[PDB]
Amino acid sequence: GAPGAPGSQGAPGLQGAPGAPGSQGAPGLQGAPGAPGSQGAPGLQGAPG
Amino acid sequence: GAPGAPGSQGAPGLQGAPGAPGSQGAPGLQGAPGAPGSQGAPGLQGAPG
């Protein structure tokens, strides 16, 4: 008779899980903002009559 | 009497759950716009005045 708990604390503190799925960090870039703009510059078109 | 080593038990090696804040953030601002089309001006020799 004498000794008590053997300081054997064993339950995991906060249950591991170092996982960063999917989003993780900065997954594939968001949308590529389309760039419209002027088209074929016909400046000074054909000569009329 | 008090038996030693009764399994003190506890939370050894505290931990931390997973996570992943990588999720899509801010993409590029509006793509380069413009005025597509007849990017030109009056043509060539025409009805004189």
Side-chain angles (χ1 to χ4, degrees):
Chain A
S8 297
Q9 51 95 39
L14 269 297
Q15 290 41 57
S23 86
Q24 176 44 95
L29 281 71
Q30 293 79 244
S38 189
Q39 298 321 137
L44 191 78
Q45 290 73 236
Chain B
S8 173
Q9 172 74 53
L14 278 294
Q15 302 105 21
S23 58
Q24 300 310 119
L29 177 137
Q30 314 96 33
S38 192
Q39 175 175 351
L44 266 75
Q45 170 90 46

